[PDB]
């Protein structure tokens, strides 16, 4: 049972190597997750300088194994069942009337730490659009994630639409396509359709001079 690896507090490391329209950047994150309470506390920094995209656009890319699955839902927790070897998480994120991100990540244990190691490639962006022009508010509108089994890839899939507030009014749509497949060869829990509900709070560290994002989340699975 991979669920047994989440009965306490787990340190988290996130690493992202990114390229949007040829603008290279890297993000490092650290924090902890508590799947018993469905809680994440993370801080991310851009290690290469100024982040060339808005922090909110990276939230979904920057660990669904920390969702709180209530007792009656344990049999549907694909994410923990793939641990410790982990899973590959891939997305395409289409920003309406702008470019798209393609992401590939390994989510797995390295020793006692849960890592999320990501490659991100963004193409076809407007150099002064809402993304590369930094026209998005520093806040978040979460959206429910309808998880479906992807039995041919022995994993899961989802399609969900995130709304990013535009400065001075307006919404920028980010249409997320997601598929996850186990890294290990052992059996995993292929779930019935269900939701993940997340609540994200973005803040800043007054003492942090690097471009950064403090991120807290509640994450909960729900049936039907």
UniProtKB/Swiss-Prot annotation:
Gene transcribed to yield this protein: GFP
Entry function: Energy-transfer acceptor. Its role is to transduce the blue chemiluminescence of the protein aequorin into green fluorescent light by energy transfer. Fluoresces in vivo upon receiving energy from the Ca(2+)-activated photoprotein aequorin.
Family: Belongs to the GFP family.
Biotechnology note: Green fluorescent protein has been engineered to produce a vast number of variously colored mutants, fusion proteins, and biosensors. Further generation of mutants led to more stable proteins (at 37 degrees Celsius for example) with brighter fluorescence and longer fluorescence lifetimes.
PTM summary: Contains a chromophore consisting of modified amino acid residues. Maturation of the chromophore requires nothing other than molecular oxygen.
Recorded consequence of changing residue 219 to R: In Azurite; shifts the excitation and emission spectra to shorter wavelengths and increases quantum yields compared to BFP
BP-aspect Gene Ontology terms: bioluminescence; generation of precursor metabolites and energy
Record's keyword terms, sorted: Chromophore, Luminescence, Photoprotein
Subunit structure comment from the entry: Monomer.
Effect of residue 141 to I: In ECFP; leads to cyan fluorescence, folds faster and more efficiently at 37 degrees Celsius and has superior solubility and brightness
Organism from which the protein derives: Aequorea victoria
Known outcome of mutating residue 63 to L: In EYFP; leads to yellow fluorescence, folds faster and more efficiently at 37 degrees Celsius and has superior solubility and brightness
Result of changing residue 64 to M: In Citrinine; leads to excitation and emission peaks of 516 and 529 nm, respectively
Record annotation: effect of changing residue 166 to L: In R10-3; matures to the red-emitting state with excitation and emission maxima at 555 and 585 nm, respectively
Phenotype upon changing residue 100 to T: In EBFP1.2; shifts the excitation and emission spectra to shorter wavelengths and increases quantum yields compared to BFP
Alphabetized Pfam families for the sequence: GFP
Tissue specificity field: Photocytes.
Outcome (variant: residue 74 to R): In Topaz; shifts the major emission and exitation peak up to 20 nm
Impact upon substituting residue 64 to H: In P4; leads to no detectable fluorescence. In mut2.2; shifts fluorescence lifetime from 3.03 to 1.94 ns. In mut3.3; shifts fluorescence lifetime from 3.03 to 1.88 ns
Effect of mutating residue 145 to I: In Azurite; shifts the excitation and emission spectra to shorter wavelengths and increases quantum yields compared to BFP
Lineage top rank: taxon: Eukaryota
Effect after changing residue 44 to L: In mut3.3; shifts fluorescence lifetime from 3.03 to 1.88 ns. In R10-3; matures to the red-emitting state with excitation and emission maxima at 555 and 585 nm, respectively
Protein name from the UniProt record: Green fluorescent protein
Impact when changing residue 28 to R: In mut1.28; shifts fluorescence lifetime from 3.03 to 2.76 ns. In mut2.2; shifts fluorescence lifetime from 3.03 to 1.94 ns. In mut3.3; shifts fluorescence lifetime from 3.03 to 1.88 ns
Signal as UniProt keyword: no
Keyword Nucleus attributed: no
């Amino acid at each position: 049972k991979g669920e047994e690896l989440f009965t306490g507090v787990v340190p988290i490391l996130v690493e992202l190597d990114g390229d949007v329209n040829g603008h290279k950047f890297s993000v490092s994150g650290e924090g902890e997750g508590d799947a018993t309470y469905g809680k994440l506390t993370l801080k991310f920094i851009c290690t290469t300088g100024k982040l060339p995209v808005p922090w909110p656009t990276l939230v979904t890319t920057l660990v669904q194994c920390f969702s709180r699955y209530p007792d009656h839902m344990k049999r549907h927790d694909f994410f923990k069942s793939a641990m410790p070897e982990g899973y590959v998480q891939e997305r395409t994120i289409f920003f309406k009337d702008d470019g798209n991100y393609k992401t590939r990540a390994e989510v797995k244990f390295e020793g006692d730490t849960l890592v999320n190691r990501i490659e991100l490639k963004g193409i076809d962006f407007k150099e002064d659009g809402n993304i590369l022009g930094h026209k998005l508010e520093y806040n978040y509108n979460d959206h429910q994630v309808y998880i479906m089994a992807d039995k041919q890839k022995n994993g899961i899939k989802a399609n969900f639409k995130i709304r990013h507030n535009i400065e001075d009014g307006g919404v920028q749509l980010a249409d997320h396509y997601q598929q996850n497949t186990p890294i290990g060869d052992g059996p995993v829990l292929l779930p019935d359709n269900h939701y993940l509900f997340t609540e994200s709070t973005l803040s800043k560290d007054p003492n942090e001079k690097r471009d950064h994002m403090v991120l807290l989340e509640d994450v909960t699975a729900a049936g039907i």
